[PDB]
């Protein structure tokens, strides 16, 4: 079913730790600078399908009459529309009810239109709030923390709504259940987001003679690449 | 509508579509409707065993044991007469109109059956009317529980019949609205010096009933009522009754109807406002 393709590549139509997930389960990022280490494989059973889903259920409680499956994709596009992440939930949550300057309109496909409340910083929060989907997972923070403290104890220093939020998680757990002190200022930590892709090191000259050619890829018996 | 309906229309169009079958040559089919009314009462027409050629409408009243002897269980029939029959388990008064036994052209019945409450209450009134319109002092006042908690009391003084007010409203402020009405209700008799009066008293009942039992409280309110001789006499022992008890539902309604109009204003001073809002951008 797959091999029917993987041809549209030539003639047919041609000539440390970070993070990355979408809808087909989450995944954490164990990689000792360079190669990944299965030594730390953890995953959350909540993803995009679950974010669209808690969002669907939330939208229904807002006043909009919607049935899934058929419209999963509409609401899905809605997900990556303006579903930003809140930074401090007590404040952000009280800023959605006390005020109404969070409200945005989206021209659906049925020419009906429907205003949207503050679920944008409520719905995607499926991480920090695993309970929203019954799941017992632990949330980006408990997850991040537990992951570094595991073996590699030595040299640890080394959806537009989360890059800034990630910085808060530097403390959430570091100060309350670990260094309960207050001179933590040190131990500096920074989060970026280049949001490019994986399409890198795929034309590297460091791969132009390090990636087995075809005079030695099978010469010594179809098995010259079963390592790495 | 200003006063209030007491003829019980929820009985006239329904009953007619049973009577009209013998006005051109049509069979009389059965029917089943079990509605209700105010003060708690709620009629309900039903067939006997399954007789489609026989209709019968009754009534369920909670406070019946109490207002039973009060002549209620004496006269009543005096109005319906032989149309009035043996009661029903679970209910009370029973009226029976036969699509077969039809006394022709006498609509003077519907209006007599519709307001079944009036006829029943009438007794408790006629009884006290004699102790004032006929004489005899040193008597005793009636007991009314149209609700578990609101109550109306009567007075069989010398020559005058007044009703006691107690009723209670929920919403703290809805209580407050009544104050506008009670004001413009007793201190503004422009109808005629013959118009009965209506004292007032909140959080406390007039002395004319301070030493007895009565629900009492800060959100609770009592009222008074009068009934000059010209109002309690026989020659008027109907016009006064025609629209008396209506007070209960008369107050709630009106007291509530204003709260609809007030909403409307909160729309003009807004329909106009939103336009003002749109009148701010480079272009509407």
């Amino acid at each position: 079913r797959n091999w029917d393709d993987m041809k549209h590549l030539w003639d047919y139509t041609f000539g440390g730790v970070v993070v990355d997930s979408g809808d087909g389960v989450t995944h954490i990022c164990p990689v000792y600078e360079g190669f990944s280490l299965p030594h730390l494989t953890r995953r959350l059973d909540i993803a995009g399908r679950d974010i669209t889903r808690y969002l669907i259920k939330l939208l229904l409680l807002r006043g909009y009459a919607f049935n899934h499956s058929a419209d999963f994709e509409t609401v899905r596009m809605i997900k990556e529309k303006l579903c930003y992440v809140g930074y401090n939930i007590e404040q952000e949550q009280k800023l959605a009810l006390e005020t109404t300057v969070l409200v945005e309109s989206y021209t659906l496909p049925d020419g009906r239109i429907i205003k949207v409340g503050g679920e944008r910083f409520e719905a995607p929060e499926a991480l920090f709030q695993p309970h929203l989907i019954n799941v017992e997972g632990v949330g980006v923070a408990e997850l991040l923390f537990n992951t570094i403290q595991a073996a590699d104890i030595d040299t640890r220093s080394e959806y537009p709504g989360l890059p800034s939020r990630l910085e808060r998680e530097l403390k959430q757990l570091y100060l309350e259940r670990v260094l309960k002190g207050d001179v933590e200022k040190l131990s500096k930590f920074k989060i970026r987001i280049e949001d490019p892709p994986r399409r890198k090191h795929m034309v590297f000259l460091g791969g132009a003679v390090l990636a087995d050619i075809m005079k030695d890829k099978d010469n010594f018996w179809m098995t010259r690449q079963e390592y790495q | 509508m200003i006063l209030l309906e007491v003829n019980n229309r929820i009985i006239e169009e329904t009953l007619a579509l049973k009577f009209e079958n013998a006005a051109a040559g049509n069979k009389p089919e059965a029917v089943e409707v079990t509605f209700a009314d105010f003060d708690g009462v709620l009629y309900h027409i039903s067939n006997p065993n399954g007789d489609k050629t026989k209709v019968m409408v009754s009534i369920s009243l909670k406070f019946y044991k109490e207002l039973q002897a009060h002549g209620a269980d004496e006269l009543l029939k005096r109005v319906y007469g032989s149309y009035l029959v043996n009661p029903e388990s679970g209910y009370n008064v029973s009226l029976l109109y036969d699509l077969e036994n039809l006394p022709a052209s006498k609509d003077s019945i519907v209006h007599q059956a519709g307001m079944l409450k009036r006829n029943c209450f009438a007794s408790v009134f006629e009884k006290y009317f004699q102790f004032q319109e006929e004489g005899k002092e040193g008597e005793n006042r009636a007991v009314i529980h149209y609700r578990d908690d609101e109550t109306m009391y009567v007075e069989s003084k010398k020559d005058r019949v007044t009703v006691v007010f107690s009723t209670v409203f929920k919403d703290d402020d809805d209580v407050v609205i009544g104050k506008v009405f009670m004001q413009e209700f007793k201190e503004g008799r422009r109808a005629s010096h013959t118009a009965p009066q209506v004292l007032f008293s909140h959080r406390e009942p007039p002395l004319e009933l301070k030493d007895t039992d009565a629900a009492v409280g800060d959100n609770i309110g009592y009222i008074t009522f009068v009934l000059f001789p010209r109002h309690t006499n026989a020659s008027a022992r109907d016009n006064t009754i025609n629209l008396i008890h209506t007070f209960r539902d008369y107050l709630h309604y009106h007291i509530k109807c204003s709260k609809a109009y007030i909403h409307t204003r909160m729309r003009a001073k807004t329909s106009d406002f939103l336009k003002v809002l749109n009148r701010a951008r480079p272009d509407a």
Partner: protein, 392 residues
Amino acid sequence: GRLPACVVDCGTGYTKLGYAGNTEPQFIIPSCIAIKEVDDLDFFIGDEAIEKPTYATKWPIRHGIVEDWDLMERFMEQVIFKYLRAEPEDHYFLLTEPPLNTPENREYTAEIMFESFNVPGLYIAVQAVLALAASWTSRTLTGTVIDSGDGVTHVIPVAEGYVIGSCIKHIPIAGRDITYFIQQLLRDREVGIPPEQSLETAKAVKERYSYVCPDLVKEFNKYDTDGSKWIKQYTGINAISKKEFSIDVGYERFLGPEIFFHPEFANPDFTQPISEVVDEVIQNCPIDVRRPLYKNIVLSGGSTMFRDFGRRLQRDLKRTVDARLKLSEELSKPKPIDVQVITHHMQRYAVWFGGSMLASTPEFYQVCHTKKDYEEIGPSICRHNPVFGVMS
């Protein structure tokens, strides 16, 4: 309390009201009303506001679903007081809501009363779902429902007991658009129909007589042989003259209601038999819901009441769908579908009928909103009104 609740199903033209656990919805009356042109007290509605010549009649439920809320509140006032008669702080209620009812629109309903009479609590029910009233008397909350009233048709189906803001389309077919045809074809026939009481006759002709015919060019000979076995004369009454005139009501009886399967038949205004439209709808829905959307065919509403109507639709919808499924075993094979109509009983003015027995129940009292709960967060907490009827 031991007291039954009040239920109201309005609609574009006629308005339906009543109590709880009754065979018919007590009364059904036109919604128009008016004041001159302190002032809110003087106003009439129903079989009264249609005669008033000093008041001007306006209709609040236009463009289908609910409209002008201010004007609506006055109506609700008379509905309660001088009609059903109930002290509202003592009775649970029910106000239908055409599908598509946005949160904004729902908020308008939740308010007013709650902020006026502070009635205990109220459910806002969906038309199509209620439109599964007595159809259970002839079990399921999945099926395809046609509610088509007077202003246009409606392909409101099911979906686990909710609205499907997508799978529905309307067809400009309406009881009246049938009437234009019957009366139109009649004009060219026997003369003697006053232009003024012309409409009168159309509304009346549609009701008192009309029916559906299995085949077109079928009876159309039996109806010319036994002309004296069906052809009757309408006993209409004049207006200004008040003179009685009888005409021979004939083909239009079955040659008119036929505008349902061929809406394009009277006037071209449409391009598709209704049964076919239903097919577009069902096959366009998600498969895991297209099957059930075939064994449940319900009508209900002021335009679905016609002799031999229910029969002719199952067949018509079935033959085309069977034909489509033929063009698929050419790859051999699949499971032949299976449609089916449903003509329960209270098809005339259902919905009210449904909801009411099922609201005369404690369950209604569970999902219903409480007064104290309303004064808490406000009226918003009524935008969503959870379904209840199967396992519950």
